[PDB]
Amino acid sequence: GSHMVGQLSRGAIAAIMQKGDTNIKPILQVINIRPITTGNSPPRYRLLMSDGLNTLSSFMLATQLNPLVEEEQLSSNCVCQIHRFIVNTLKDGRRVVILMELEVLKSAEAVGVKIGNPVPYNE
């Protein structure tokens, strides 16, 4: 409804990246999804997600969630609640968020636009 950005967990991206808050179950919007160059493994999907305030491109789907993308329930513009995730840190210091369980609250067709004007999270 009205006040669309009120549907999203504003501040969750900063909470995840800094505090390392993991007990939260934030509601985020999918902005973009794309497959990763994998080789001969099942595909991996990388997601650009928004909390209304920030976007962050360092999300990856657990392979068990691949059917959500492949059967088109999880697509750009949909709004999801993250129920389980972990943060990992690469050798170079970059952090990545692995989404393990999520729920689609509103399909892409029911939302239809990028909500608000989120800006890229820095670090």
Residues in contact with ligand 1XU by CB under 6 A are 36-37, 46, 58, 60, 62-64, 88, 90, 94, 96, 98
* Calpha distance 58→46 (Å, rounded): 7
Q: Which is nearer to ligand 1XU, 58 or 77 (CB)?
A: 58
Q: How far is the CB of 64 from ligand 1XU (least distance, A)?
A: 5
Return the HEC string of 51-71: CCCEEEEEEEECHHHHHHHHC
Q: How far is the CB of 81 from ligand 1XU (least distance, A)?
A: 19
Q: How far is the CB of 11 from ligand 1XU (least distance, A)?
A: 20
* Calpha distance 94→121 (Å, rounded): 13
Q: Which is nearer to ligand 1XU, 34 or 110 (CB)?
A: 34
Helix, coil or strand: residue 34: strand
Both tokens of 110, joined, read: 């029911």
Both tokens of 78, joined, read: 């949909």
Q: Which is nearer to ligand 1XU, 58 or 111 (CB)?
A: 58
